[PDB]
Design a protein around this ligand. Structure first.
Ligand SMILES: OC[C@H]1O[C@@H]2OC[C@H]3O[C@H](O[C@@H]4[C@@H](O)[C@@H](OC[C@H]5O[C@H](O[C@H]([C@H]2O)[C@@H]1O)[C@H](O)[C@@H](O)[C@@H]5O)O[C@H](CO)[C@H]4O)[C@H](O)[C@@H](O)[C@@H]3O
Ligand SMILES: OC[C@H]1O[C@@H]2OC[C@H]3O[C@H](O[C@@H]4[C@@H](O)[C@@H](OC[C@H]5O[C@H](O[C@H]([C@H]2O)[C@@H]1O)[C@H](O)[C@@H](O)[C@@H]5O)O[C@H](CO)[C@H]4O)[C@H](O)[C@@H](O)[C@@H]3O
Ligand SMILES: OC[C@H]1O[C@H](O[C@@H]2[C@@H](O)[C@@H](OC[C@H]3O[C@H](O)[C@H](O)[C@@H](O)[C@@H]3O)O[C@H](CO)[C@H]2O)[C@H](O)[C@@H](O)[C@@H]1O
Ligand SMILES: OC[C@H]1O[C@H](OC[C@H]2O[C@H](O)[C@H](O)[C@@H](O)[C@@H]2O)[C@H](O)[C@@H](O)[C@@H]1O
Ligand SMILES: OC[C@H]1O[C@H](OC[C@H]2O[C@H](O)[C@H](O)[C@@H](O)[C@@H]2O)[C@H](O)[C@@H](O)[C@@H]1O
Ligand SMILES: OC[C@H]1O[C@H](O)[C@H](O)[C@@H](O)[C@@H]1O
Ligand SMILES: [Ca+2]
Ligand SMILES: [Cl-]
Ligand SMILES: [Cl-]
Ligand SMILES: [Mg+2]
Ligand SMILES: [Mg+2]
Ligand SMILES: [Mg+2]
Ligand SMILES: [Mg+2]
Ligand SMILES: [Mg+2]
Length: 1060
């Protein structure tokens, strides 16, 4: 025999086992315990056995039985049997051939556990900032204590000490307690916590009595797993959930946005390509938000499983792991708030706010793994310029020596001992990188900022590489690695990414300072703008030990966030504009930069999973989220996928293209120019440009939303039920979302699709591209060819934009981040609305703008704050008869050219039905009033048409044209029209031409019929308006025009307008 091996926990992997583990790893009462053992080489006459004690008494040896052979190894199973709660088992596994040299593993000890639950509350002590509930247990000898405290008046914290020896934390004092024999009720202005005493059972209500959530009906819901003496290994609680309850968040999830029915693992993992199918993630957070208006956060870095009505149809549960330490309390929060987004804000109060990034982070990021030399960077920049792609971010991955990851590829130098840091001048730059500082300067010259790829591991591939070997020696001599549990440095398991590499212990501040010192010259001298901090899902092994005294079970989920945060803070300390770009983390990840959705293939299925990842991350407080648009690997995307992806990406928090392959031919860049080359579809370029230019037009809105995340916890991109939690149609939507406060975005994420269903919540929505009006409260069908993205603005929206003199979306304003071209506010008037604009160009002043819509009196008023810039309003309305600024008349400009020349003025855009109003910069509020205005027209051409078509061959129409002829039976034009100012009689203006003869049409108003007379117009180039009395109810009204048997003559039908 050459050896024997058994190790009960293997690498402690959640998903797999090594072939030499104990099963179960942590045996409970009544579970059969199997030991898997290996010997080598394969030989006759081998004996494998187990020497062991039960509660200190030597047992008869167990003989292991042959199981299987693989390679030059035999695998064996030894059966120890079942045990009782409290049993302490110690064993050693042994092997030898024909009574020769004996090889052994162990000794190993396990303590056999079972569940104990809270039984009754026996007394309650109110300490003014905390409440102690003294408890009995269902089994065992503990005297548990549950501590209640308020993180705020709407955020409840539970801390359980099974032994009673630990004490909970103080919280707010603003509560009262009604403590009776049978029940204790804890009340704040926001919450009513009702706790039955016998059996103990908690219900969490809002202050008005509405139930948020509650412990399971049968009580004994809250428990711990113990041997009663040495260990507590798990905690659980169990809660009642009705059949319609939806559960969102849990970090970044690829499979679904609503986790009901699933067991969700809070476990970071590097899963390539098939995250959705395996239900794995790089970014796992033990926090969810329910559409029943609460969130739950289990405050622990240990692995937890959330069982979301996956076992019992009306029960959800959490099972939280522990390392055995009996002094670690269970700590969790039930989180209420003013609305769903406020629940997320309260969660970020606990775990950390998003840090506002510089505005350059919100432009296009360009990346490709194949970029590996200065000529590649030069050509990326010149390709972007030649194709009018004004990006702001630039990533280099294949930049380094591929050994130290802090030295440029091909650089030569005198190696340094003892981990001493390099300066720029220590290097002779050669080959692929002759002048890194110059290269960076060229990136900056293009208006871009650059980040460099990093990992948290010291690579050790077993080869000789002087500087890396020097650094490894130094790192070990200082104790800068984690420890494997035996005194040796922890290494990533050999089969994994960077296997054999030594992790830097990011819990050790000295270690971090050393590691970052080696990169300092990249920031201070080369002038980089941050790091793409990749990896981090690299902590395996229960005995792996960190400088904070924590071990592998506790640190696996936390490690990536320690790593990412260390680098983010370090880069920012030198370069205040630095940005991190990362994939892995847990609670608190949001403090430290951008998160991208990792490694996915270029398919529509992947696109679907990416969108779910962003929407779940958003609920989990990770707002600055990116994805590799159209996928970074697999076969090159189709033109269709590339175009659909581009549109979504332009309307996502962070826009970035990227590609996996390191030296491919042809190129694998997901750049728009390479996509044209690879697909042969030249129309990719103008479509990409449209969406990129539109994003840059919206940058003032986007960046205000980024600040709103940082300040108020409102994520930039949100699943519909975050804004509409009571809306039954919004619960499961995963192919549309809100972007900022105002825009409903509905990407096409299905191959071959052109009829996109869009669910519109109650209220009026307006198509931002063309002014099409859509009353809410139904699913509409929107025709979207491959170049088209349905996007709608909600009623009352005030949307800041940076426009060219053309004043249309999708016109290139460039990538200047320090000035505006034409600062513009797009307004959809509806009652009184207000918006706080983040004017970052002018010192970050908040500009409070308000609009008062009064269409009943044919007026819209805008209260413009003091501004540093000329401003243009674009107000969705009919053409005013006059406009005043501070009471002073402003003249109508007849053309766009005249408007651009004017200092102040107004202009009416007939295509978009937008009134442009130009106001000078002034260090004082300005009152703008639009007079004689009504709600914008309902264009006939945007109506539901039956057997009738559109044209535009006679000038003077509004919108894009008119409905032509409309002069046979079974032809109809249907409008969905909102009552502008509630249920009332109104006048419907019908604008038409009838160049040959008097016409009539029939109209139905919510089923009520009348015939209208449309007198002849002089010719087909003359429009007239007839006023029709109608009666409209609140909200959406069905207005149907048709041509019936008693109607006559052709018309061209331009629009209708509703006015008082
Ligand atoms: O040149 C730097 C670096 O480039 C490549 O990795 C960057 C890549 O990392 C992340 O995805 C990776 C994935 O590409 C793949 O990598 C395996 C690969 O790792 C090393 O080489 C990397 C490049 O892949 C190189 O150092 C190693 O030398 C090589 O032998 C290996 O084949 O798989 C891992 C494991 O799943 C994955 O994490 C990142 O997500 C991605 O955006 C980035 O492009
Ligand atoms: O060039 C003459 C004429 O040609 C086209 O119409 C052919 C059509 O004419 C007569 O019926 C029309 C009817 O179709 C409808 O036309 C509305 C239409 O009028 C003008 O364009 C038409 C052509 O379509 C043109 O005059 C106008 O430019 C366009 O914008 C309008 O949509 O209504 C009128 C009035 O009731 C009627 O005269 C003719 O009777 C019929 O047989 C023939 O097919
Ligand atoms: O394919 C040769 C390549 O293999 C290894 O690197 C690859 C890397 O190039 C990348 O390839 C993506 C590619 O993977 C499969 O071939 C798949 O069928 C295809 O659709 C997809 O586009 O990613 C994989 C996985 O990360 C890497 O293994 C070698 O490292 C490299 O030397 C070789 O050139
Ligand atoms: O720390 C290892 C090594 O780094 C530099 O050399 C890098 C590289 O230089 C040339 O390209 C050679 O052809 C390669 O063999 C080298 O790896 C230092 O100059 C060198 O002193 C040092 O040992
Ligand atoms: O939101 C309004 C409308 O937008 C698109 O259609 C625009 C299209 O409408 C008519 O066909 C006009 O004649 C054209 O000039 C316009 O471009 C969507 O496809 C549609 O579904 C939506 O209702
Ligand atoms: O093993 C290290 C190698 O990994 C990948 O293949 C990289 O593309 C290459 O640049 C590097 O030399
Ligand atoms: Ca029209
Ligand atoms: Cl144990
Ligand atoms: Cl891995
Ligand atoms: Mg709050
Ligand atoms: Mg290259
Ligand atoms: Mg700088
Ligand atoms: Mg130490
Ligand atoms: Mg689906």
């Amino acid at each position: 025999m050459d050896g024997e091996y058994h190790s009960p926990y293997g690498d402690d992997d959640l998903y797999t086992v090594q072939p030499t583990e104990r099963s179960p790893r942590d045996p409970k009462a009544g579970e059969d315990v199997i030991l898997n053992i290996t010997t080598w080489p394969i030989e006759n006459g081998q004996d494998v056995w187990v020497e062991w004690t039960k509660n200190g008494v030597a047992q008869e040896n167990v003989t292991a039985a042959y199981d299987y052979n693989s390679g030059n190894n035999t695998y064996w199973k030894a059966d120890l049997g079942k045990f009782e709660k409290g049993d302490e088992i110690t064993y050693t596994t042994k092997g030898s051939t024909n009574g020769g040299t004996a090889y052994e593993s162990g000794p190993f000890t396990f303590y056999v556990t079972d569940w104990e639950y809270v039984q009754d509350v026996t007394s309650v002590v109110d300490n003014g900032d905390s409440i102690t509930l003294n408890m009995t247990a269902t089994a065992g000898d503990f005297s548990p204590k549950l501590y209640l405290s308020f993180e705020d008046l709407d955020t409840l914290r539970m801390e359980l000490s099974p032994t009673g020896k630990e004490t909970g934390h103080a919280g707010k004092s603003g509560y009262t307690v009604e403590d009776t024999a049978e029940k204790v009720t804890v009340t704040t202005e926001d919450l009513s916590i009702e706790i039955q005493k016998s059996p103990y059972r908690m219900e969490v209500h809002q202050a008005d009595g509405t139930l948020l959530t509650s412990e399971y009906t049968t009580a004994n819901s809250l428990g711990w797993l113990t041997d009663g003496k040495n260990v507590i290994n798990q905690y659980q609680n169990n809660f009642m959930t009705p059949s319609d309850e939806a559960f969102y968040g849990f970090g970044e999830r690829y499979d679904t946005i609503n986790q009901r029915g699933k067991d969700v693992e809070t476990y970071v993992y590097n899963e390539y390509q098939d995250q959705a199918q395996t239900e794995r993630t790089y970014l796992a957070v033990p926090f969810f938000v329910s559409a029943n208006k609460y969130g739950m956060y289990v405050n622990s870095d240990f692995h937890s499983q959330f069982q979301m009505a996956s076992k019992v149809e009306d029960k959800y549960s959490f099972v939280l792991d522990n390392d055995g330490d009996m002094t670690n309390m269970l700590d969790y929060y039930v989180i209420s708030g003013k609305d769903q987004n406020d629940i997320v804000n309260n969660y970020t109060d606990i775990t950390g706010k998003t840090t506002l990034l510089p505005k350059w982070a919100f432009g296009l990021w360009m990346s490709a793994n194949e970029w590996d030399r200065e000529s590649d960077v030069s050509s990326a920049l010149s390709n972007a310029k030649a194709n009018d792609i004004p990006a702001t971010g630039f990533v280099l991955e294949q930049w380094s020596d591929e050994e130290t990851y802090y030295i440029w590829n091909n650089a030569t130098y005198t190696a340094k001992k003892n981990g001493e840091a390099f300066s720029y001048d220590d290097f002779t730059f050669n080959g692929k990188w002759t002048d890194p500082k110059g290269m960076v300067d060229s990136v900056h010259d293009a208006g871009m900022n650059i980040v460099l790829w990093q990992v948290p591991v010291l690579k050790d591939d077993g080869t000789v590489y002087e500087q890396r070997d020097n650094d490894e020696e130094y790192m070990i001599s200082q104790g800068y690695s984690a420890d494997d549990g035996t005194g040796a440095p922890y290494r990533v398991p050999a089969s994994q990414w960077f296997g054999n590499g030594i992790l830097l212990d990011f819990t050790n501040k000295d270690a971090v300072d050393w590691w970052t010192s080696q990169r300092e010259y990249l920031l201070t001298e080369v002038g980089i703008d941050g790091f793409k901090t990749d990896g981090g899902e690299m902590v395996w092994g229960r005995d792996t030990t960190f400088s904070n005294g924590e071990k592998g079970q506790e640190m696996r989920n936390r490690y990536p966030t320690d790593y990412v945060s260390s680098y983010f803070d370090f880069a920012k300390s030198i370069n205040p504009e630095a940005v991190s770009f990362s994939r892995s983390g847990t609670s608190g990840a949001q403090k430290s930069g951008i998160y991208w959705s990792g490694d996915q293939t270029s398919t529509f299925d992947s696109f679907q999973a990416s969108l779910k990842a962003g929407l779940s991350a958003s609920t989990s407080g990770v707002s600055y989220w990116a994805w590799d648009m159209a996928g970074f690997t697999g076969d090159y995307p189709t033109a269709e996928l590339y175009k659909r992806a581009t549109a979504m990406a332009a309307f996502a928090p962070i826009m970035q293209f990227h590609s996996e392959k390191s030296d491919p031919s042809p190129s694998e860049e997901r750049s728009p120019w390479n996509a044209v080359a690879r697909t042969g579809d030249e129309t990719i370029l103008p479509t990409f440009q449209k969406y990129l230019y539109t994003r840059m037009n919206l940058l003032p809105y986007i960046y205000t939303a980024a600040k709103d995340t940082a300040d108020n916890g409102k994520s930039m991109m949100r699943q519909m039920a975050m804004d509409y939690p009571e809306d039954v149609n919004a619960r499961d939507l995963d192919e549309q979302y809100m972007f900022g406060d105002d825009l409903l975005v509905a990407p096409i994420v299905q191959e071959g699709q052109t009829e996109k269903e869009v669910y519109l919540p109650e209220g009026e929505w307006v198509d931002i591209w063309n002014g099409g009006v859509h009353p809410g409260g139904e699913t509409i069908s929107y025709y979207a060819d491959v170049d088209t993205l349905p996007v709608f603005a909600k009623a009352g929206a005030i949307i800041p934009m940076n426009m060219t003199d053309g004043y249309q979306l999708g016109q290139n304003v460039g990538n200047d981040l320090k000035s505006y071209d034409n600062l513009t506010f797009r307004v959809y008037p509806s009652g009184d609305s207000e918006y706080s604009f983040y004017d970052d160009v002018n010192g970050g002043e908040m500009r409070d703008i308000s609009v008062s819509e009064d269409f009943a009196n044919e007026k819209v008023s805008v209260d413009l704050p003091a501004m540093a810039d000329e401003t243009t309003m674009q107000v969705f309305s009919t053409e005013p008869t006059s406009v005043t600024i501070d009471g002073a008349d402003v003249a109508k400009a007849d053309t766009l050219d005249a408007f651009n020349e004017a200092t102040t003025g107004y202009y009416y855009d007939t295509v978009q039905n937008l009134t442009y109003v130009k106001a000078a910069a002034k260090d004082a509020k300005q009152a703008i009033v639009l007079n004689g205005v009504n709600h914008a027209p309902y264009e006939a051409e945007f109506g539901h048409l039956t057997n009738v078509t559109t044209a535009s061959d006679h000038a003077g129409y509004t919108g894009t044209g008119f409905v032509a002829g409309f002069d046979a039976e079974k032809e109809a034009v249907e409008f969905d029209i909102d009552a502008v100012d509630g249920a009332s009689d109104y006048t419907m203006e019908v604008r038409y031409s009838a160049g040959v003869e008097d016409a009539t049409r029939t109209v139905y108003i919510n089923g009520k019929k009348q015939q209208i007379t449309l007198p002849k117009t002089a010719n087909w180039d003359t429009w007239n308006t007839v006023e029709v009395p109608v009666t409209l109810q609140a909200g959406n009204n069905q207005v149907v025009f048709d041509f019936e048997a008693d109607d006559t003559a052709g018309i061209n039908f331009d629009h209708v307008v509703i006015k008082k």
